[PDB]
Amino acid sequence: SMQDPIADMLTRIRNGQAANKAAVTMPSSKLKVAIANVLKEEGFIEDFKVEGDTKPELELTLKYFQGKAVVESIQRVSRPGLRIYKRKDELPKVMAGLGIAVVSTSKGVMTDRAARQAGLGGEIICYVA
Amino acid sequence: MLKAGVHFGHQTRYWNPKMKPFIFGARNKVHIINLEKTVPMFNEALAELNKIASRKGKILFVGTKRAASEAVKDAALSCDQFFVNHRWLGGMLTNWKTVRQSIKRLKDLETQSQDGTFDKLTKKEALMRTRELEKLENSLGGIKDMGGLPDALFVIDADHEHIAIKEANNLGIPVFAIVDTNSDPDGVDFVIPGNDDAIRAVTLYLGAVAATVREGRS
Amino acid sequence: SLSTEATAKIVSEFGRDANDTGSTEVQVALLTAQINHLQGHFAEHKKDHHSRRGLLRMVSQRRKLLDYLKRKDVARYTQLIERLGLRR
RNA sequence: CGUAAAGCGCACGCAGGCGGUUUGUUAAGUCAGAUGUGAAAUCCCCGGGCUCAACCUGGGAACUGCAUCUGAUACUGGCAAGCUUGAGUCUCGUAGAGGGGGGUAGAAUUCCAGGUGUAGCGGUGAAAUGCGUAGAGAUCUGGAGGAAUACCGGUGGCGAAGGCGGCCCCCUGGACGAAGACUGACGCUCAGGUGCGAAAGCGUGGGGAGCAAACAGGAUUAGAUACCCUGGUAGUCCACGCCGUAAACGAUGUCGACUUGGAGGUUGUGCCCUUGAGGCGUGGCUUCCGGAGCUAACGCGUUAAGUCGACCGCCUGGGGAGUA
Ligand SMILES: [Mg+2]
Ligand SMILES: [Mg+2]
Ligand SMILES: [Mg+2]
Ligand SMILES: [Mg+2]
Ligand SMILES: [Mg+2]
Ligand SMILES: [Mg+2]
Ligand SMILES: [Mg+2]
Ligand SMILES: [Mg+2]
Ligand SMILES: [Mg+2]
Ligand SMILES: [Mg+2]
Ligand SMILES: [Mg+2]
Ligand SMILES: [Mg+2]
Ligand SMILES: [Mg+2]
Ligand SMILES: [Mg+2]
Ligand SMILES: [Mg+2]
Ligand SMILES: [Mg+2]
Ligand SMILES: [Mg+2]
Ligand SMILES: [Mg+2]
Ligand SMILES: [Mg+2]
């Protein structure tokens, strides 16, 4: 029963790439907009909106390039049934460093590559190949 | 721009889910293909046809469904390229090297009947030879003058003549074609939306093709 | 079963006004009233296990609603349960 | 974990696990820093010494740990105040073999009594046992009983599953739709537990037409303790208990999200001209075919066996054995 909204976001994007849908519309949340902000800034998603009032239905705009969708893969890691909190150096690189891994830290939600500069780590949210 | 006649789409309920961009709903319980998206498509496709025609590349105009075959044969012999209006023998491209001797056979035999052995063996034999001749003349006649491999395989349909597409798609051959609502724009590159079962439609598209290719020899 | 008028009365006794109907106390009241009205139907028949099952459903429903109510506010909870006639 | 071993038969549900959204706080987890410790050897690295090596050995790193201390505060947890999209209650209806209790009707089989009437009837592959001039079978009338409900009836409906069909009343459960109203995360799952659970069976008291284990006879057969025939008891039926199992099977746990189509079925409602047995929409349940993808393959395919999440159950070669 909708136990994990984040994994739901990731899977909306995943099925949105498989079906090659344009926009993906989902209920919003602070963490939602943070993660979508990370993916956006990194370039996985072309823009987004948090259009909505009392029920913010934020929609993402999926990216494509040649024929294949941009998102190679996007597995949820720190699931609610198994939280994962990597140490600073312990922070994993995805695809030898050419694929960011969204990690939540005390300074906010950010890429692991940035958390290597921030000198600190935290809960790793999701690998984005 | 609707240049002349009617060719909006047709079929009915069983539209291929892949062609969502190019469909609408007619009150006659049948889809009408958009012309707005269609115009740049066949425009640019004809442009490519002119570019490869200047490249002096061999083209194949594939056709079937009886009434369309005539339009096809007319659009090649009136032009200069090649055509397969009748039965499209499986593996005539990716298996082309045996078809090659099939053609050698056609040519040498049609030569044999026109001056050589016209009845030498038996009257019955002459009958059989004329028969088989006509068979190979209408089976692989349009590709007789080739001897190489087509630079482009323009097809009169997609979903019906699927094997031509899948075959010519196995190698470096562009395969732009006029496709109907139920057709798959998968193996096809430059898709050209528009109805297909109508004769005016195939005469229109194929004729435009005749123009653009006819400019390639200049 | 429980008549529509019965509910019309019960609401105007466990809520704000006739307009309201969704509050916890009202729901619990309803559940209990219905259950009590059903006690009879199972005095006989007894083999009626499907109806029975509907009952069990509304019963556990009631225990959940009551549990919530308690955790939310033990005060008025004690009032409700002391009035509705239950508890061990 | 559909078919190879493997989803409990189904449900309810305590502890446990997990949990929508906004704000505040706290800082438990988490993270950063610092200090203390983490015996020596051993392992690793760079040197040194035995003629080399083994071995010895100096320094270093390592000892993935633990604890206190000052910070961070995104994410999770606790406490606080909330929000409405989850869940729930209310209002109006709709369909239904949902269930329990009480009635009731028609066709038929069997039995019983009598009429008419006459030698076969019955059965099978054939036949015999069986019934029959003590008058059967056929036939008509009157009666008595028990059981199941042709037609409708449909991959149609309802139920959690088992399962439920003549019609009628009585008590009663759940599902769905419409426009709202209100509650404010009350949710999901669930070991142990509790309930329900075909048939057969068991107990007690009834009932007993048909049917039919056991049994008997006749055949068939090398034999036939079976198949087939003639009989026929328990049982099948009712009341109340017990049993607790099925290939309890979409061989497919439950809940939630997402992801192209087509033809249907069934049941609501909105809309349009009912302007003519229609047209365009929106929900629920359900059958078949198929796309991407998945799959060992077969196949599944928006009621997934796809893409994910939560929780539970179970599997770890065949046999012994689901036995002691
Ligand atoms: Mg198995
Ligand atoms: Mg099951
Ligand atoms: Mg709990
Ligand atoms: Mg939360
Ligand atoms: Mg702390
Ligand atoms: Mg040491
Ligand atoms: Mg040395
Ligand atoms: Mg050191
Ligand atoms: Mg907090
Ligand atoms: Mg908090
Ligand atoms: Mg309200
Ligand atoms: Mg259990
Ligand atoms: Mg029984
Ligand atoms: Mg008995
Ligand atoms: Mg029992
Ligand atoms: Mg079993
Ligand atoms: Mg099973
Ligand atoms: Mg299928
Ligand atoms: Mg045993």
The structure tokens listed for B15 are: 């539209």
Which ligand sits closest to the CA of A31?
4
β-pair type (B152-155, B191-193): unpaired
Which residues, 6+ apart, have CB-to-CB distance to A12 below 8 Å? A24, A26
Distance CA B134, CA B136 (A): 6
Give the residue among B153, B186, B159 at the shortest CA–CA distance from B171: B153
Distance CA B99, CA C72 (A): 85
Residue B7's Cβ-count burial label (10 Å; 0-12, 13-18, 19+) is: buried
Q: Which residues pair with B192 in a beta bridge?
A: B178
The structure tokens listed for C15 are: 């809520």
Question: Rounded to 10 degrees, what is the CA torsion of A103, A104, A108, A109?
Answer: 50
Distance CA B72, CA B83 (A): 7
Q: How many residues does chain B have?
A: 218
DSSP secondary structure string, A44-66?
Answer: SEEEEE---SSS-EEEEEE-BSS
Nearest residue for D13, CA–C1': C60
Question: Rounded to 10 degrees, what is the CA torsion of C2, C6, C7, C10?
Answer: -130
CA of C56, C1' of D90: distance in angstroms:
21
Give the residue among B76, B135, B80 at the shortest CA–CA distance from B102: B135
Give the residue among B184, B205, B210 at the shortest CA–CA distance from B195: B205
Between the CA of A120 and the centroid of ligand 9 the distance, in Å, is 19
CA of A87, C1' of D69: distance in angstroms:
20
- Within 7 A of a protein CB, which nucleotides of strand D? 11-14, 17-23, 29-33, 71-76, 83-86, 88-92, 98-101, 159-162, 171-174, 180-188, 195-197, 240-241, 255-263, 280-281, 291-293, 302, 306-311
Name the phi and psi angles at C83, rounded to 5. Answer: -85, -40
Distance CA B153, CA B21 (A): 24
Nearest residue for D189, CA–C1': A1
The structure tokens listed for B174 are: 């562009």
Amino acid at C86: L
Total structural domains in chain C?
1
Neighbours of chain C (3+ CB pairs under 8 A): none
User: Was domain A74-128 assigned CATH 3.40.50.300?
Assistant: no
Amino acid at B53: A
Helix (H) or strand (E) holding A124: strand A124-127
Using CA atoms, how far residue B159 sits from B15, B164, C81, C86, in Å, is 11, 10, 72, 72
Give the residue among B198, B203, B154 at the shortest CA–CA distance from B49: B154
How would you classify residue A46: left for phi > 0, otherwise alpha for psi between -120 and 50, otherwise beta? beta
Residue B48's Cβ-count burial label (10 Å; 0-12, 13-18, 19+) is: middle
Residue C74's Cβ-count burial label (10 Å; 0-12, 13-18, 19+) is: exposed
List the alpha helices (DSSP H) in chain A: 5-18, 30-42, 112-115
Contact indicator for B153, B81 with CB cutoff of 8 Å:
no
β-pair type (B191-193, B177-179): parallel
Hey, what CATH topology would domain A5-69 get? Ribosomal Protein S8; Chain: A, domain 1 (3.30.1370)
For chain A, residues classed under CATH 3.30.1490.10 are 74-128
What kind of experiment solved this structure?
cryo-EM
Between the CA of A18 and the centroid of ligand 18 the distance, in Å, is 20
For chain A, residues classed under CATH 3.30.1370.30 are 5-69
Q: How far is CA C87 from the centre of its chain?
A: 13
β-pair type (A101-105, A124-127): antiparallel
